[PDB]
Amino acid sequence: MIQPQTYLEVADNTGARKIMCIRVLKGSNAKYATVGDVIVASVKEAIPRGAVKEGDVVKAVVVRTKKEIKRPDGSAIRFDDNAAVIINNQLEPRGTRVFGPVARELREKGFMKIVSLAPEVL
C-alpha cells in the first residue's frame, strides 16, 4: 500500500537511494499502489554522480511492499521494505541491475527486464 508521501527504497543502480511517491498512476484517483503498479516520485536521496539526482521527478514500478499481497492460490507474500525500480515510459528499467528479491506479479504486468535482472523472484 503505497500512496503520496510514502518513501520507497530504490532497488536498482540508477543512483537514487530513496524516492517519495507523489502520485500512483492507476486511473483518476487510485488510493494505493501495490506491486506491479507505476508511481511518479520525487528523488529524495541519491548517491553522487548517478544517472538520476535529488530533485528529479521520475517514474518507478513498485517491486516490493511491506503490506502483504494476496495471491489466488490462497498464499501471501510480504517483504521488509517498500521498494521500486525506476523506469522510463516504455516501462524499461532505467539502470542496469536490480537488487534484492521482487514479487512475481511484476511478470504478469509486463516488467520482464526487471524480473529477469532480479536475483530472486518470489
Binding site: 516490493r64 502483504e68 492460490d73 490462497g74 498464499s75 501471501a76 507474500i77 510480504r78 517483504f79 521488509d80 521494505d81 521498494a83 537488487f99 534484492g100 528479491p101 512475481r104 511478470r107 536475483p119 530472486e120 523472484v121 518470489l122
Partner: protein, 131 residues
Amino acid sequence: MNRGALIKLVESRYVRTDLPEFRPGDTVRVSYKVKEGNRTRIQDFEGIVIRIRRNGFNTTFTVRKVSYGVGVERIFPLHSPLIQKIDIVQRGRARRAKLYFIRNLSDREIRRKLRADRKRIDQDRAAERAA
C-alpha cells in the same frame, strides 16, 4: 443439524495428512508449486516458521527468510494443494507461539534466542529408523 460437522464434511475432501508436523521456531523448506511462463515449476522456500494460525482445515503458517539482504515472509495454507512437500531442516525451541519479535533481531541474536530443540531432534532421529 450440526453446522460444524457440515463444514468439516465439505472440507474433508481437501484435507491433507501427508505433511510433517512442525512448530514455531522450526526451520522448514516448503516445496511450493509456482506458475510463471510458459510453465509451472517447484520453488523451495526455506525459513523459520514464526506463526501457525490454527482453524482446522483453515490453519495457515508463516515462514520467514532473508533473501539477498531483505526480509521475506510467506503465508501458506497448511492444506494447500500447491505445497508439494514440507521438509524439516532444523528443530528450534521457542518460548512462545508467535515469533514476530525476530523481525527486529540480528542473525546473531535470533541464533541465540532460538537454540536447537534437542529433544525433538532426538525424536526425529529415533524415528526415520525404518523397518
